[PDB]
Amino acid sequence: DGENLRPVVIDGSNVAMSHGNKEVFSCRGIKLAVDWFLERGHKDITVFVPAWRKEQSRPDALITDQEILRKLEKEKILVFTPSRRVQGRRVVCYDDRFIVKLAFESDGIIVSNDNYRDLANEKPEWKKFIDERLLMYSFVNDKFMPPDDPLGRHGPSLDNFLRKK
């Protein structure tokens, strides 16, 4: 029973960079984050990751355990944001905008340590949404630890934070 639960939108790139080495795109972090929400009963989970991350590990952009991305895609959970090469240069659509817009329109939660304040300054309704619906986190090795107080001490509990009740 997970439609008393708010839909969950995970910043795949943020979580990947947060987990393990802070200089490595660690896809296990994405799996661990998703698994944490799955074990609680969530059924509406979307992970946004730029499409160019499917490319093999380059020295500029290191990445581990790539197979998880496609696996999560086949499981309907992960969605790739558009990206392509024009005239020898990589063009990337702002995945952060996908994250914010989807979560806002689905009336859900954003899982990220990124504040997205450029987008917040762009649209007032987005700023208010982010202020009230951003779930930050911390990684202790393979342990995914979100705070019981997402909005501080006067905010709701983590349990009630994820419910539409």
Contact residues: Mg ion, CB under 5 A? 96
Task: Report whether 44 contacts 164 (CB < 8 A).
Answer: no
Q: How far is the CB of 61 from Na ion (least distance, A)?
A: 11
For Mg ion, which residue has the nearest CB? 96
CB atoms within 10 A of CB 46: 20
CA 70, 100, 143: angle at the middle one, nearest 5? 55
Q: What are phi and psi of 10, to 5 degrees?
A: -105, 125
> Could you say whether residue 26 binds Na ion (CB under 5 A)?
yes
26 binds, among Na ion, Mg ion, none (CB under 5 to 8 A by kind): Na ion
Q: How far is the CB of 115 from Mg ion (least distance, A)?
A: 11
Q: How far is the CB of 2 from Mg ion (least distance, A)?
A: 26
DSSP, collapsed to helix, strand or coil, labels residue 72 as: helix
> Could you say whether residue 112 binds Na ion (CB under 5 A)?
no
Residues that bind Na ion (CB under 5 A): 17, 19-20, 24, 26
